[PDB]
Amino acid sequence: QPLSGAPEGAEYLRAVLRAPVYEAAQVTPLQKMEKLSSRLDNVILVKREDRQPVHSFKLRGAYAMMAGLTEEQKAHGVITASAGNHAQGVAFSSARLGVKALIVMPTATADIKVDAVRGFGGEVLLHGANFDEAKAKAIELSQQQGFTWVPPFDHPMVIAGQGTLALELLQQDAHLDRVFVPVGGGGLAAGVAVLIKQLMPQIKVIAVEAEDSACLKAALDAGHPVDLPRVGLFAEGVAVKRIGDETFRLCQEYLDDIITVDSDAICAAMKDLFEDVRAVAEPSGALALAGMKKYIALHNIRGERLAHILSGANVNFHGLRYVSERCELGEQREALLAVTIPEEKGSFLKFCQLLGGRSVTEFNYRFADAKNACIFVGVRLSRGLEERKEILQMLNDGGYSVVDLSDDEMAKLHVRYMVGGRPSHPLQERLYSFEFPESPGALLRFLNTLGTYWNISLFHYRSHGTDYGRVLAAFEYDCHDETNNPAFRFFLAG
Amino acid sequence: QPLSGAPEGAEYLRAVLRAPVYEAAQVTPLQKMEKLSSRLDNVILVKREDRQPVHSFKLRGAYAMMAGLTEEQKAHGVITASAGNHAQGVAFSSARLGVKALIVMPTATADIKVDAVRGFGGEVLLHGANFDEAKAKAIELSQQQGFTWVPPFDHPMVIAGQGTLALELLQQDAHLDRVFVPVGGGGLAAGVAVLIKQLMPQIKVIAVEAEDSACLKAALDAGHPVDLPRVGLFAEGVAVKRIGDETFRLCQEYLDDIITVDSDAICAAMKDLFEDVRAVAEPSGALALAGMKKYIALHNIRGERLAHILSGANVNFHGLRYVSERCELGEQREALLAVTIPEEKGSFLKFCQLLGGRSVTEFNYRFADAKNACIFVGVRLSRGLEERKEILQMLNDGGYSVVDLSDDEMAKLHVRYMVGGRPSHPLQERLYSFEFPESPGALLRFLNTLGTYWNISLFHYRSHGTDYGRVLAAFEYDCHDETNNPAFRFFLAG
Ligand SMILES: *Cc1c(COP(=O)(O)O)cnc(C)c1O
Ligand SMILES: *Cc1c(COP(=O)(O)O)cnc(C)c1O
């Protein structure tokens, strides 16, 4: 309990030091990013918060708040919240303190999230449609059954428990220059600032928020918790509409700066974490790095010791896909080509023969009658632009190609999933499916072996890292006759 | 050195106990899988080997072998290998012992893998084309410069160092029933068996190999290290042609059984690790779980305490994509529909209006003239088959749909990347790109807002979890005129 007002600097310190976090939570490693740090020119360190048993930090504050309630036998009474990632923190906590918790969530949440909570401990009650709706209940039941509302953020105790991290940080590397903090409701940044600010003033504390969830920046600018019209939903755990409150706006008087960023950045930040530390972030968990990356360049900060927080790690395996897909876009990984090859009766072979070694990502074609049936080709590069530059020229010895891959947002994002369709007039073709161990030039072989005496009307191929069914081809190494195939009919045939 | 023969049971034990592994390596957590264990009905535990500083286990054996060489001042002399995941182990080791190491790799390896090694420590020499070619050199240089060849597996010392794990295992949970071990060259299984077999005989030790890299099963069957014609390349670290040797075939006289499995399984096993432990495997690192899963059912093993090894974790972020993509196939996640909607002048709206709440993954269409332009629709499900069963019937109140999603390997794997093409005859259309915050029914809104008075000729949409550019539409919320767009021309236009 002991905080529900306007704690003063020190009071927070005290609360921080006195908070029983470790009974449930753990000090989290603070490791350095070797690739990135070396890339940019500073020491970059990450606060491995995903290593708590609830994979995020929330555990701290719920534990602190909840564990210092019981001084009032009001556990006997009870507790309740409404959520997805913090409902976890409470769950985990309720169980440890043997205090019954109730978690209210929307009605159509997701088995997965409902079981985690149920898992940790906690009883859920699925009641809502909207979130606000779930929370109206929670809050109801409070009042009626007397459960104790447990804030995801707006709370001195909750805040004090998060500072806990700061406390660790400073003891893990006191030669820190700047620290980057994610901003959802503001718990975490709030608890991190006060601390550091008390202990080591010279430490810079930058909040970092979602371009699309910029609760803070916005309230800042009005100097007023302000409701947001819309809130992005990538960075789930950061999707807050109106920042914290008092405690938050209040406390953000220790904040040194603020910075927003876009989903696309987050998606990179995720790539980064993974690649160096082999850590798996969750949008908001990567959010703060991204910011850094941003700040680094902005201010041309070279030479410092900076650290950010791997806030959490609750993400769907399949969510991973999207990410990649997005970074790929931002990267210069492949070549995307509109290569027109003259033939119909002859082959693609010749054309291939000069990409025999190079890695084929896509090679999609559909009969079309224009003396020159065009081909959507994709080639996995290494040397980026320079290597493409080759392919290109090289290919300049015959058919004429077009470099649809550079900035062709259209190809890169839609058309490379659209090449096909229908021919023109009915066709006496046959459909077949082929599969073959992927290698660096397996295709060729396939093609070579396939022969050159075919009136191939259709070709489809996506490859290393995205599909195991290898090829679908239509004429006029493993085979399956897929002729009158339903899909084909309805969309390709015609 | 002390092992280059036919170590006898105990000798291994000794070597195991005497091996200096911890100077470089760490005891690895052995945690239980709560979801899965509860799913299947046994206690399933994973040997978190990805937690070594080289993210795999290799560190053990290279360290053991290498650290007990120096008793011969032949470090002064030197060491060399040829690789990707084990070249790492040696690197890391060479540096710690301050013994110069040289790593030979093919000529066109991959910056990434070359830098890791360089990272850890070690000097690489990129010389090859083929792998065998890189190793011919390594072996050369030995002979000439006197470097000491360090086996990835064929070696009593190397083997003894891997047993180290076993040693841990048994001390981490002695109530184990069965243990599953991945099989590349056979180091790890070899070192794991001997141990356990010495210490606790009643422990079952199943190797688990790649359907496509079944080195062992094969040699077993002939009773003869046998060269494999082909070797899969998913499970990189398990891609061995002819099992170990003596040490391996020899030692596999302590093995209780063996079992293979397919890439597709591995891809699930990867999903699993991630979802419960939030660990990120690498094909071979998941290989062994998959096996389990297999064995579990085979033998209807209920009630046991079984554990497997998270062998390693070196994987490309982008590699992740493929995986998902594969599990999705094996799952029953979405609905794939050939829904024919009658209109041309009117709309898709009406059709939509009854999926307004349900989640849209794809909604792709191209003008075609048939009184009824057909639509490739995709819908994210929850209740699996049952829920689809609905959509279906529900949709039975109007246009007639076809359920191309069930077992339609064709749609699920090729066509859902092929719907489009060209129309029939030239078209006086205009292309536009739209983007809009994704939600549960944002589309609708888009559509509704888009209006109903449009002679829309083209539509393309892939969604939550795979693309941020939302829509591409062609007529006769953010907009961009993308009309004479190059890609479009060449492949859609026509
Ligand atoms: C909950 C959470 C946040 C931010 O929380 P606040 O205390 O409201 O700022 C950020 N990242 C992750 C992963 C989170 O779970
Ligand atoms: C090297 C390795 C293996 C198997 O090695 P062996 O000792 O040859 O059996 C398996 N999984 C991973 C991740 C590996 O790196």
What single letter denotes the amino acid at residue B160?
A: A
Count Cβ atoms within 10 A of the Cβ of residue A223 and give its class: 0-12 exposed, 13-18 middle, 19 or more buried.
exposed
H helices present in A19-122, as ranges: 34-39, 59-67, 87-96, 111-120
Tokens matching residue A91: 């769950």
User: Is B58 a catalytic site residue?
Assistant: yes
A340 strand-pairing partners = A374
Mutate to test the pocket of ligand 2, among B28, B284, B315 (most ligand atoms within 8 A of CB): B284
In a domain, B41, yes or no: yes
Name the nearest CA neighbour of A258 among A297, A210, A212: A210
Taking the C-alpha atoms of residue B176 and residue B200, their distance in angstroms, rounded to an integer, is: 10
Using an 8 Å Cβ cutoff, are B281 and B50 in contact? Answer: yes
Using an 8 Å Cβ cutoff, are B132 and B31 in contact? Answer: no
- Angle, CA of B357, B359 and B361, to the nearest 5°: 155
Q: From residue B89, how far is each of B81, B139, B444 by CA, in Å?
A: 10, 18, 54
Q: What kind and span of H or E run contains B258?
A: strand B257-261
Tokens matching residue A83: 């959520």
In a domain, B352, yes or no: yes
Name the nearest CA neighbour of A160 among A8, A290, A51: A8
Q: How far is B269 from chain A (nearest CA, A)?
A: 12
Q: What kind and span of H or E run contains B472?
A: strand B471-475
Taking the C-alpha atoms of residue B342 and residue A159, their distance in angstroms, rounded to an integer, is: 58
Q: What kind and span of H or E run contains B30?
A: strand B30-32
Lookup result for tokens 């990267």: A331
Cα distance from N-terminal residue to C-terminal residue, chain B: 71
Instruction: Look at B317 and A274 and tell me if their CB atoms are within 8 Å.
Output: yes
Q: Residues with Cβ < 8 Å from A486, sequence gap 6 or more?
A: B338, B402, B404, B408, B410, B411
Tokens matching residue A21: 């976090």
Instruction: Look at B421 and A420 and tell me if their CB atoms are within 8 Å.
Output: yes
Contacts of B263 in chain A (CB under 8 A): 468
Taking the C-alpha atoms of residue A433 and residue A337, their distance in angstroms, rounded to an integer, is: 24
Instruction: Look at B490 and A374 and tell me if their CB atoms are within 8 Å.
Output: yes
Given B283, B315, B347, which residue is the final one in a domain? B315
Count Cβ atoms within 10 A of the Cβ of residue B425 and give its class: 0-12 exposed, 13-18 middle, 19 or more buried.
exposed
Provide φ and ψ at A9, rounded to 5°. -15, -80
Q: What kind and span of H or E run contains A443?
A: helix A442-450
A474 strand-pairing partners = A431, A458
Taking the C-alpha atoms of residue A63 and residue A19, their distance in angstroms, rounded to an integer, is: 9
Q: Residues with Cβ < 8 Å from B265, sequence gap 6 or more?
A: B290, B293, B294
Taking the C-alpha atoms of residue B139 and residue A433, their distance in angstroms, rounded to an integer, is: 43
Taking the C-alpha atoms of residue B184 and residue B388, their distance in angstroms, rounded to an integer, is: 42
Would you say how long chain B is, in residues? Answer: 494
Taking the C-alpha atoms of residue A225 and residue A45, their distance in angstroms, rounded to an integer, is: 32
DSSP-derived pairing of the beta strands B30-32 and B43-47: antiparallel
What SS3 class is residue A130? coil
In a domain, A328, yes or no: no
Residues of A labelled catalytic: 58, 311
Classify A177 in phi/psi space as left (phi over 0), alpha (psi -120 to 50) or beta.
alpha
B80 strand-pairing partners = B102, B149
Taking the C-alpha atoms of residue B275 and residue B268, their distance in angstroms, rounded to an integer, is: 10
DSSP 8-class letter at B371? S
What single letter denotes the amino acid at residue B465?
A: G
Classify A478 in phi/psi space as left (phi over 0), alpha (psi -120 to 50) or beta.
beta
Same domain? For A33 and A172 the reply is yes
Name the nearest CA neighbour of B409 among A364, A366, A470: A470
Q: Which atom of ligand 2 is least distant from the CA of B244?
A: 8
Rg (CA), chain B: 28
**Chain-centre distance of CA A112, in angstroms?**
18
Q: How far is B438 from chain A (nearest CA, A)?
A: 8
Q: How far is A418 from chain B (nearest CA, A)?
A: 5
DSSP codes joined into one string, B181-246:
EE-SSSHHHHHHHHHHHHH-TT-EEEEEEETTT-HHHHHHHHTS----S---SSSGGG--SS---I
Q: Which atom of ligand 2 is least distant from the CA of B313?
A: 13
What single letter denotes the amino acid at residue B393?
A: Q
What SS3 class is residue A248? helix
B432 strand-pairing partners = B473, B481
DSSP 8-class letter at A483? T
Using an 8 Å Cβ cutoff, are A490 and B374 in contact? Answer: yes
A186 in ligand 1 pocket by Cβ < 6 Å? yes
Tokens matching residue A314: 């609750």
A283 in ligand 1 pocket by Cβ < 6 Å? no
Q: From residue B421, how far is each of A161, A494, B84 by CA, in Å?
A: 58, 11, 42
Using an 8 Å Cβ cutoff, are A374 and A421 in contact? Answer: no
Taking the C-alpha atoms of residue A94 and residue A87, their distance in angstroms, rounded to an integer, is: 10
Neighbours of B330 (CB within 10 A): 12
Using an 8 Å Cβ cutoff, are A438 and A478 in contact? Answer: no
Q: From residue A376, how far is each of A404, B114, B212 by CA, in Å?
A: 9, 32, 31
Q: Residues with Cβ < 8 Å from B18, sequence gap 6 or more?
A: none
DSSP 8-class letter at B252? T
Lookup result for tokens 């109903």: B452
DSSP-derived pairing of the beta strands B148-149 and B30-32: unpaired
What single letter denotes the amino acid at residue B38?
A: S
Burial A67-106 (b: 16+ CB within 10 A, else e): bbbeeeeebeebbbbbbbbbbbbbbbbbebbebbbbbbbb
Taking the C-alpha atoms of residue A269 and residue A285, their distance in angstroms, rounded to an integer, is: 9
DSSP codes joined into one string, B44-85:
EEEE-GGGSTTSBSTHHHHHHHHHTTTTSS-SSS-EEEE-SS
DSSP 8-class letter at B147? P
Name the nearest CA neighbour of B367 among B462, B470, B475: B475
Same domain? For A209 and A354 the reply is no
DSSP 8-class letter at B248? I
In a domain, B181, yes or no: yes
Q: Nearest by CB to B494, from A368, A411, A462: name it.
A: A368
CA–centroid distance, A188 to ligand 1, in Å, is 7
Breaks (C-N over 2.5 A) in chain B follow: 476
Same domain? For B254 and B292 the reply is yes
Using an 8 Å Cβ cutoff, are B415 and B461 in contact? Answer: no
B148 strand-pairing partners = B79
Per 3-state DSSP, what percentage of chain A is helix, strand, and coil (rounded to 5)?
A: 40, 20, 40
Name the nearest CA neighbour of B189 among B252, B144, B147, B146: B252
Using an 8 Å Cβ cutoff, are A48 and A31 in contact? Answer: yes
CA–centroid distance, B182 to ligand 2, in Å, is 7
Q: What lines the ligand 2 site, CB under 6 Å?
A: B 56, 58, 85-86, 153, 182-189, 237-238, 282, 284-285, 311-312
Lookup result for tokens 């080591």: A200
Using an 8 Å Cβ cutoff, are A84 and A55 in contact? Answer: no
Q: Residues with Cβ < 8 Å from B250, sequence gap 6 or more?
A: B6
DSSP codes joined into one string, A139-200:
HHHHHHH-PEE--SS--HHHHHHHHHHHHHHHHH-TT--EEEEE-SSSHHHHHHHHHHHHH-
Given A152, A185, A202, which residue is the final one in a domain? A152
Classify A203 in phi/psi space as left (phi over 0), alpha (psi -120 to 50) or beta.
beta
A209 in ligand 1 pocket by Cβ < 6 Å? no
What single letter denotes the amino acid at residue A161?
A: G
The CATH number covering residue A55 comes to: 3.40.50.1100
DSSP codes joined into one string, B277-318:
H-----HHHHHHHHHHHHHHHHTT--S-EEEEE--B----TT
Same domain? For B459 and B379 the reply is yes
Q: Whose CA is nearest to atom 4 of ligand 2?
A: B184
Same domain? For B162 and B290 the reply is yes
Name the nearest CA neighbour of A93 among A126, A121, A57, A135: A121
DSSP 8-class letter at A372? B
Same domain? For A370 and A462 the reply is yes
Tokens matching residue B403: 């359920």
Same domain? For B343 and B442 the reply is yes
What SS3 class is residue A377? strand
DSSP-derived pairing of the beta strands B148-149 and B257-261: unpaired
Residue A184 annotated in ligand binding:
yes
DSSP-derived pairing of the beta strands B471-475 and B458-460: antiparallel
Instruction: Look at B418 and A364 and tell me if their CB atoms are within 8 Å.
Output: yes
Q: From residue B287, how far is each of A330, A339, A394, B44, B158 by CA, in Å?
A: 32, 40, 41, 15, 22
Residue B319 annotated in ligand binding:
no
CA–centroid distance, B270 to ligand 1, in Å, is 27
Would you say how long chain A is, in residues? Answer: 494
Using an 8 Å Cβ cutoff, are A218 and A166 in contact? Answer: no
DSSP-derived pairing of the beta strands A43-47 and A305-309: parallel
Taking the C-alpha atoms of residue A116 and residue A319, their distance in angstroms, rounded to an integer, is: 17
Q: Which atom of ligand 2 is least distant from the CA of B309?
A: 11
Same domain? For B53 and B71 the reply is no
Q: From residue B138, how far is each of A16, B84, B125, B142, B278 by CA, in Å?
A: 58, 14, 9, 6, 38
DSSP codes joined into one string, B83-143:
-SSSHHHHHHHHHHTT--EEEE--SS--HHHHHHHHHHS-EEE---SSHHHHHHHHHHHHH
In a domain, B322, yes or no: no
Taking the C-alpha atoms of residue A307 and residue A208, their distance in angstroms, rounded to an integer, is: 12
Resolution in A: 2.8
Instruction: Look at A317 and B327 and tell me if their CB atoms are within 8 Å.
Output: yes
Using an 8 Å Cβ cutoff, are B460 and B376 in contact? Answer: no
How many domains does one find in chain B?
3
A237 in ligand 1 pocket by Cβ < 6 Å? yes
Tokens matching residue A242: 């109106």
Same domain? For B383 and B358 the reply is yes
Cα distance from N-terminal residue to C-terminal residue, chain A: 71
Name the nearest CA neighbour of A336 among A410, A400, A398, A386: A410
Neighbours of B109 (CB within 10 A): 18
In a domain, A422, yes or no: yes
In a domain, A321, yes or no: no
The CATH number covering residue B360 comes to: 3.40.1020.10
Beta strands across the sheet bearing B30-32: B30-32, B43-47, B305-309, B178-182, B204-210, B257-261
Using an 8 Å Cβ cutoff, are B101 and B122 in contact? Answer: yes
- Residue B247 sits in which domain range? 1-60+153-315
Q: What kind and span of H or E run contains A338?
A: strand A334-340
Interhelix angle A87-96/A59-67, rounded to 10 degrees, is 50
In a domain, B326, yes or no: no
Name the nearest CA neighbour of B474 among B482, B465, B486, B463: B482
Q: Residues with Cβ < 8 Å from B207, sequence gap 6 or more?
A: B180, B181, B182, B183, B186, B189, B216, B252, B255, B257, B258, B259
Taking the C-alpha atoms of residue A488 and residue A486, their distance in angstroms, rounded to an integer, is: 5
Interhelix angle A111-120/A87-96, rounded to 10 degrees, is 20
Same domain? For A91 and A191 the reply is no
Same domain? For B291 and B355 the reply is no
Using an 8 Å Cβ cutoff, are B49 and B57 in contact? Answer: yes
Tokens matching residue B286: 């998941």
Instruction: Look at B468 and A263 and tell me if their CB atoms are within 8 Å.
Output: yes
What are the start-end ranges of the E strands in B301-457? 305-309, 334-340, 359-366, 374-380, 430-435
Using an 8 Å Cβ cutoff, are A157 and A61 in contact? Answer: yes
Instruction: Look at A324 and B321 and tell me if their CB atoms are within 8 Å.
Output: yes
Lookup result for tokens 């536009």: B432
Taking the C-alpha atoms of residue A89 and residue A97, their distance in angstroms, rounded to an integer, is: 12
Q: Whose CA is nearest to atom 4 of ligand 1?
A: A184
CA–centroid distance, A253 to ligand 1, in Å, is 19
Neighbours of B253 (CB within 10 A): 10
DSSP codes joined into one string, A278-332:
-----HHHHHHHHHHHHHHHHTT--S-EEEEE--B----TTHHHHHHHHHHHTTT
Contacts of A421 in chain B (CB under 8 A): 366, 418-422, 492
DSSP 8-class letter at B440? T
DSSP 8-class letter at B372? B
Given A131, A152, A173, which residue is the final one in a domain? A152
Q: From residue B17, how far is each of B69, B181, B190 by CA, in Å?
A: 17, 21, 16
Using an 8 Å Cβ cutoff, are B326 and B333 in contact? Answer: no
Q: Residues with Cβ < 8 Å from B201, sequence gap 6 or more?
A: none
Residue A121 annotated in ligand binding:
no
Name the nearest CA neighbour of B311 among B197, B185, B220: B185
What single letter denotes the amino acid at residue B289?
A: L
Same domain? For A196 and A309 the reply is yes
Taking the C-alpha atoms of residue B4 and residue A442, their distance in angstroms, rounded to an integer, is: 40
